[PDB]
Structure 1
Amino acid sequence: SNVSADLIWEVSRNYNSFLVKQRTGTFSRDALNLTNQHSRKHAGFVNDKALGIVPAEKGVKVIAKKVKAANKPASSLYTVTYKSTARKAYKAIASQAAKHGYRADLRQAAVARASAILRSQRPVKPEPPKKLRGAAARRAA
């Protein structure tokens, strides 16, 4: 055939609508891109098998590409929400990524993304008051 993951990467390597390039780095805002980096490894929209993790209301929501529905986008994503426990979510995501050979190279990235989202969903601590060093004398008067 004329179309493959390598061909799609060849045609989308230099520019695509998900690319965000600037000094100090080039990122990708693709939904199926763990680490949000621009590379064949993580450009999930070009690969037949890919994973994406987004925040849920209380846990994480994981989408995986279904290989048989690559031409049917409305039914091309297998979605599952994990809102029980951080460790159970990690276990399920790691199984999803490695047990059946579905992008085993993305296991660490997917677990780290789930951990980062769950950490962000925690309450934030208030910032300590900011001290003054040169403004202290001028504002003390």
Structure 2
Amino acid sequence: SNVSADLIWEVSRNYNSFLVKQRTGTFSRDALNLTNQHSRKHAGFVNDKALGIVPAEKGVKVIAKKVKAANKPASSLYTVTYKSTARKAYKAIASQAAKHGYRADLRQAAVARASAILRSQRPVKPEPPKKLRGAAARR
């Protein structure tokens, strides 16, 4: 055929609607992007097999592409919400990423993304009071 993941990367490497470019690096807003970095490894929309993790009310919501439904967006994402313990969520996500040959390279990235979301859902410690110094302290 004429369309492949290699072609979509070539078309969309230099510019995208998901691309964020600054002096210190290039980021991506793609929902199927585990590290939010612009690369062929992590460009979810480019790849036929890709993963993405988004927060839920409690837990994580993992979405994976269905290869046999690339032309049906409404039925192209396999969505699982994990609201059990953190370790059980990591087990399923890693098995989802490596036990069948569906992006085993993203196993470590996917588990880390789930960990960050679960950590971000934890209660927040109150910050210590600010301390003035020198001239500011004496006024």
Q: Which category describes the TM-score, using the shorter chain as reference length?
A: over 0.9
1:134 and 2:128 aligned: no
Distance between the aligned counterparts of 1:137 and 1:117, measured in 2? Answer: 39
Q: Structure 1 residues 32 and 137 mapped into 2: Cα distance closer, same or farther (>3 Å)?
A: closer
Q: Structure 1 residues 137 and 19 mapped into 2: Cα distance closer, same or farther (>3 Å)?
A: closer
Distance between the aligned counterparts of 1:35 and 1:135, measured in 2? Answer: 43
**What residue number does 2:63 align with?**
63
Distance between the aligned counterparts of 2:55 and 2:63, measured in 1? Answer: 11
Q: Structure 1 residues 138 and 96 mapped into 2: Cα distance closer, same or farther (>3 Å)?
A: same
Name the SS for the 1:49 alignment partner: coil
User: TM-score, with normalisation over the residues of structure 1?
Assistant: 0.96
User: TM-score, with normalisation over the residues of structure 2?
Assistant: 0.98
Give how far 1:30 is off. 0.3
How many residue pairs get aligned? The number is 139
Report 1:99-114 matches (<5 A).
99-114=99-114
Name the SS for the 2:10 alignment partner: helix
What is the Cα-based RMSD across aligned positions, in Å?
0.8
Q: Structure 1 residues 99 and 133 mapped into 2: Cα distance closer, same or farther (>3 Å)?
A: same
Distance between the aligned counterparts of 1:132 and 1:89, measured in 2? Answer: 44
- 1:60-108 per-residue CA deviation (whole Å, 9 max, x = no partner) reads 0000000000000000000000010100000000000000000000000
Q: Structure 1 residues 43 and 137 mapped into 2: Cα distance closer, same or farther (>3 Å)?
A: closer
**What residue number does 2:42 align with?**
42
Name the SS for the 1:74 alignment partner: helix
- 1:18-74 per-residue CA deviation (whole Å, 9 max, x = no partner) reads 000010000000000001000000001000000000000000000000000000000
**What residue number does 1:29 align with?**
29
Q: Unmatched 5+ residue regions in structure 1?
A: none
Query: After the TM superposition, which parts of structure 1 deviate over 6 Å for at least 4 consecutive aligned residues?
Result: none
Give how far 1:134 is off. 1.9
Identical counterparts, % of pairs: 100
Name the SS for the 2:105 alignment partner: helix
